[PDB]
Write a protein that binds this ligand. Structure first.
Ligand SMILES: [Cl-]
Ligand SMILES: [Cl-]
Lengths: 430, 430
């Protein structure tokens, strides 16, 4: 009966407009250097993952690689990222020896759950006899298209035929539509969602990897007291329910993790009690119907299903959790995710955000490094960044945002589209 | 490792320009009816797979669904096909009960190997404790763009930065480039490649599902003796080496299979010695470097690797095989695929095609129903269509193209891009 261990991994800085690392007209190197391409990010990410996992010089003992990516075929005109991953170890050195040659690889995809799906696929290979050491890397580049062209691409997450007509920013508009229903049922408020953003940015300010690291926002600004915090939607039914600060960033970046089973650890010279490890006690995936939406906007049924499956499988309750990473593609989502995960009861995420319970000094800190709101959302990377952020907290590696009490139990909740795909894992510190 | 059984599956007609089933100006219903959308193909495919697998009324015993698709995000503006699959069983019956709700689902992608990769992913879930019965479906719609546009999209399978420049028809140009090198090393000829096409069209003529079922072509025509069989490439270095008839069809269609382990069969009331079943003795995947090409165009090293891994895992040799399905994205590729699979030694595919050994009455029939050339190539479906074609021959289901001696051992070889991803299975009849 075969356990799965996080051995190590790597998260790149997440970059886009508003980051000093993002090269644009404004930037000292505009004209001299360029932002990384997807290929370069995938290269930096696979290499970093191998390095931080003790695999440098022995990359050949990895059995297989899975890539999570949503829109590479659109933003970067590039699909078929498996062989891209296979050429990533020695990218840009012609004819170099390549220990990864001929190993199995593929790209998996389920909108913003694509990294989460890459981890589950790697885990099935670990439990199946196919692999003892797997690499799961997630990468995304989205800064190559205008905001509106980008919006149309991200609508690939939605039921395009049915929902694209709502707004050029289809996917935001779907969360603004939830917020309307949520406000109508007094489930929570736009002040509450502002408090989520306040928290995300304050955390991001302590994370040099975060897209919005350098951006400071007060609750007041996040609540709409700032002329630049615009209600940008075109759809007049939903316009008033979503501010710029309520939305995740359009970022580029990657995250990688090495996952091993007990034979994998043996091959690396490691024991299962090794203090650099974290055990994935469980992982579960739930998918609903792309074509049909539940009436109750105040419940993410699919994400609730995934979390309840993961916790049950690991035999714990949400109150046992010491830390969580959840899918705050909007502030609206973070609130819904506290309830989906079960750290708050239905209609009570608001108590949590009012009382500070999910802040860095709260009793259940969530998205300690900034979340998708401030850390950023390079779509395919996000599912794997969530795992590595729990890992990093457990190993005491988060520096200015390190939790004071090293967490014993953590949970991840990764969602694709409008709660249509959900992946949730339970992690146990070793 | 539990064993894995094909319980049933389904192939749709493959449609595009040249099929009487494809609606265009010249078709009796042009203006009245439309061709199926990707959602409609996925619906028809998921449904038909369940119907020909005995899962009707019990679809809930399926543990997971994996969709293979390459370019849905481009041609149909739609990613996130996992929840599209979960909504496919009851598509257009609004509000209906849905036994697939909340089950795990994802899309996998490796260019034209995407369906092969679906099958292996579904197999790992079956060997891992996660699944006892799985549904693997592959679907594609590509008729929504012009030829040249479609060329650019399919170039997502290439190293786009490095190779898109070769020609609008990037993929055909890359195989024309192999043909030039092949001719310079007398490996085989354009007359040989014409014979592959003659065979593919003669087989397609006996297959009412084939895109080119209606189209009769002699060897002469396939060999360039037909003014309309044009050398269409723009790239003057490679132009002379590729005719229209050497190329797979731009088709829309789907294919699905239900795969169960021994516990899955038990649940369905089936024994593993049930003569409706086929066993997948082995499956393997090999992936090379997207960014670097081997010098010897006369060897598909990656496909050779995948086949040698499969056959070895099954403990057989190519001479044990009775039937195969291989990836004839071009006639040129079929010839290479004989050598990759090992049914001809290096430099000897030509003997095979000259002697008729891979015809329907040969000793090792290949692509008995027309291959990607005549059956058609809806990219994501192809890998699964290949499994089902071996299954169908084994179960005596192929009608005018049924082999007279029921095959005991079959192989598939599925490839993505320019021999950068390969997946090969060994099937054993029961
Ligand atoms: Cl999404
Ligand atoms: Cl391809």
């Amino acid at each position: 009966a075969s356990r799965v261990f996080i051995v190590g991994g790597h998260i790149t800085p997440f970059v886009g407009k508003g980051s000093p690392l993002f090269i644009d007209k404004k930037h000292p190197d505009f004209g001299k250097k360029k932002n990384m391409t997807l290929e370069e990010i995938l290269a930096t990410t696979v290499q970093g993952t191998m390095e931080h996992s003790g695999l440098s010089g022995r990359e050949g003992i990895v059995d297989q690689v899975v890539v999570g990516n949503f829109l590479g075929e659109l933003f970067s005109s590039q699909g078929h990222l498996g062989p891209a991953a296979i050429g990533s170890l020695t990218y840009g050195q012609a004819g170099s020896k390549n220990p990864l040659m001929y190993k199995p690889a593929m790209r998996v995809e389920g909108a913003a759950a694509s990294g989460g799906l890459a981890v589950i696929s790697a885990m099935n290979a670990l439990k199946s006899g196919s692999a003892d050491i797997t690499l799961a890397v997630g990468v995304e580049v989205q800064t190559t298209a205008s905001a509106r062209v980008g919006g149309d691409y991200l609508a690939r997450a939605a039921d395009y035929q049915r929902q694209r007509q709502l707004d050029d920013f289809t996917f935001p508009c779907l969360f603004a539509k939830r917020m309307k229903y949520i406000a109508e049922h007094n489930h929570f408020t736009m002040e509450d969602t502002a408090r989520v953003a306040a928290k995300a940015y304050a955390n991001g300010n302590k994370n040099p990897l975060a897209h919005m690291h350098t951006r400071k926002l007060t609750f007041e600004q996040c609540n709409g007291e700032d002329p630049s915090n615009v209600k940008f939607l075109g759809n007049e039914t939903y316009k008033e329910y979503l501010r710029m600060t309520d939305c995740s960033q359009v970022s580029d970046g990657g995250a990688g993790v090495v996952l091993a089973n007990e034979e994998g650890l043996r091959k690396m010279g490691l024991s299962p009690n090794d203090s650099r490890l974290v055990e994935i006690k469980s992982i579960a995936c739930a998918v609903s119907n792309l074509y049909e939406d539940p009436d109750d906007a105040c419940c993410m049924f699919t994400s609730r299903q995934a979390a309840q499956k993961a916790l049950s499988m690991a035999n714990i309750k949400p109150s046992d959790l010491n830390v969580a990473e959840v899918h705050d593609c909007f502030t609206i989502a973070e609130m819904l995710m506290y309830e989906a995960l079960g750290i708050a009861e239905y209609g009570h995420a608001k108590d949590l955000i009012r009382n500070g319970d999910t802040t860095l000094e709260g009793r259940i800190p969530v998205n300690t490094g900034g979340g998708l709101l401030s850390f950023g959302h390079p779509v395919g990377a996000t599912g794997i960044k969530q795992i590595m952020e729990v890992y990093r907290q457990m190993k005491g590696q988060c520096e200015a945002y390190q939790m004071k009490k090293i967490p014993a139990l953590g949970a991840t909740l990764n969602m694709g589209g409008d709660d249509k795909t959900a992946v949730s894992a339970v992690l146990q510190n070793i």
